Design a protein around this ligand. Structure first.
Ligand code: MVL
Length: 482
């Protein structure tokens, strides 16, 4: 419809933002993941992942949609990179599909898979887009899950390190910025606490599991796998390739509902279980105190050697930040362990004095709370010794069921980005060592359990034709970044 092409004046209101408002060399980019954008899930030599198996169960994804094709970046990568360049972005964080490189997780390399990533990276470099390569975004090769239950076995650690090592050796001559994992908290909690994500394990889940122990086991092995991969990079590659390696951690801002000691403690406890679970080991070589005291024997311990390997195993930390909630003390605690989520012993709140903390996006979990990004970045600065940070994801979603015509006029997303980036700038002006910002995501894509019912892109994708239509938010970035 002709209204698709109405010029939204919001595009040109940058709210005082520009590159001059950020540090010299500050990177702006977009982020996506292999499974969510590539397609060719069962082609090109790619081995099955745990999500290929998980999606097979009817009812798992709305309308039984799959990511077998999704937005087909496998074939359309030049177009996508061209849009990124045209909108003024400096960088693209993509992920490498483990099972596209090693169909069964180990051993035989799938050369067709290697050739794909080589094409993608060479084109990015040609067009002057900086590659940031994440090694893992939820896509464990099914064979490793079948062999020894994947993240639940110590066997996975060296399996991951070998895969990482291969990637460094193969792609590290042009990829200078690496991440080991996207959101290991999500991998552990959604995969093994409530089974919402693959492999769908939890207490009483059809696939089996134990919510009291398995999340902590998976998280422990993810931390070890991260540190073993970083060891490979540091000992064999870093000096020659002159790149950097880190990890991507989700961080919801938890704000005390009131200034009571109990509510402040509740908020800290939520931070500990959400972020500290991974960041305390990396920065201090130990788990958070609250977690140790609450979870006790159900949390694995690091050997002295492991602790040394894990501590300072990053050159920077990616903070994936979207939203904030209020946190309350929930009263006396139940003494019987039931789940990781229950181990937090906190109460969530979404409003205070009849006022919502913010408007909701399409996603049930996503509340629009711009001030939260400032508090979250300041918290990491003050708590973890002013580490080098990348704000590695930020964005919001519309319903999937919107047309091209209305889908492109995403004024709410412009406001989201203007406000959140403004609040991030305040944190940086106050001393936070943030070196980059990445929007989730360039394209509308396969949104895990929500399938195609959620649209996170700054570029609309018609799923019938796979044609791209930049939304007003993409043009907002284009104007702001120029
Ligand atoms: O929900 C939108 C996106 C996901 O598509 C993706 O897994 C990303 O890593 C992420 N972290 C928090 C939210 N999101």
């Amino acid at each position: 419809a002709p209204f698709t092409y109405w010029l939204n004046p919001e595009i040109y209101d940058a709210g005082g933002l520009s590159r001059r408002a950020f540090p010299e060399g500050f990177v702006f980019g977009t982020a996506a993941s292999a499974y969510q954008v590539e397609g060719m899930a069962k082609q090109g030599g790619r081995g099955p992942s745990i999500w290929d198996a998980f999606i097979e169960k009817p009812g798992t994804i709305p309308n039984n949609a799959t990511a077998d094709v999704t937005v087909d970046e496998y074939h359309r990568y030049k177009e996508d990179v061209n849009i990124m360049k045209n909108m003024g972005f400096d960088a693209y964080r993509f992920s490498i599909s483990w099972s596209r490189i090693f169909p069964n997780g180990t051993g035989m390399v799938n050369q067709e898979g290697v050739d794909y990533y080589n094409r993608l990276i060479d084109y990015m470099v040609k067009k002057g887009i900086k590659p940031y390569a994440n090694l893992y975004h939820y896509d464990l090769p099914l064979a490793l899950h079948e062999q020894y239950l994947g993240w639940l076995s110590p066997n996975i650690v060296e399996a991951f390190a070998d895969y990482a090592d291969f990637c460094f050796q193969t792609f590290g001559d042009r990829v200078k910025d690496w991440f080991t994992f996207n959101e290991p908290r999500c991998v552990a909690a959604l995969g093994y606490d409530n089974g919402f994500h693959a492999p769908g394990r939890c207490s009483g889940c059809d696939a089996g599991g134990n919510s009291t122990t398995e999340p902590y086991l998976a998280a422990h092995h993810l931390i070890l796998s991260h540190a073993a991969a970083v060891k490979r990079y540091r000992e064999k590659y870093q000096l020659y390739q002159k790149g950097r390696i880190g990890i991507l951690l989700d961080f919801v801002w938890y704000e005390p509902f009131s200034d009571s000691n109990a509510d402040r403690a509740a908020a800290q406890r939520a931070r500990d279980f959400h972020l500290g679970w991974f960041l305390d080991p990396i920065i201090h070589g130990r788990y958070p105190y609250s977690m140790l005291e609450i979870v006790k024997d159900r949390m694995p311990t690091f050997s002295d050697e492991e602790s040394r390997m894990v501590k300072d195993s990053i050159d920077y930390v990616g903070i994936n930040h979207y939203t904030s909630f209020y946190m309350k003390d929930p009263g006396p605690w139940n003494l019987t362990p039931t789940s990781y989520q229950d181990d937090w012993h906190v109460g969530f709140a979404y409003e205070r004095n009849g006022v919502p903390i913010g408007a909701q996006a399409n996603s049930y979990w996503l509340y629009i709370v711009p001030w939260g990004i400032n508090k979250a970045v300041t918290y990491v600065k003050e708590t973890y010794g002013n580490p080098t940070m990348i704000l590695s994801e930020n964005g919001m979603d519309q319903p999937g069921n919107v047309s091209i015509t209305q889908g492109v006029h995403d004024t709410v997303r412009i406001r989201y980005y203007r406000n959140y980036i403004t609040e991030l700038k305040k944190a940086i002006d106050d001393g936070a060592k943030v070196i980059g910002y990445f929007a989730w995501s360039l394209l509308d894509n396969f949104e895990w359990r929500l399938g195609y019912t959620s649209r996170f892109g700054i570029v609309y994708v018609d799923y019938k034709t796979l044609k791209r239509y930049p939304k007003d938010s993409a043009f907002w970035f284009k104007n702001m970044l120029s």
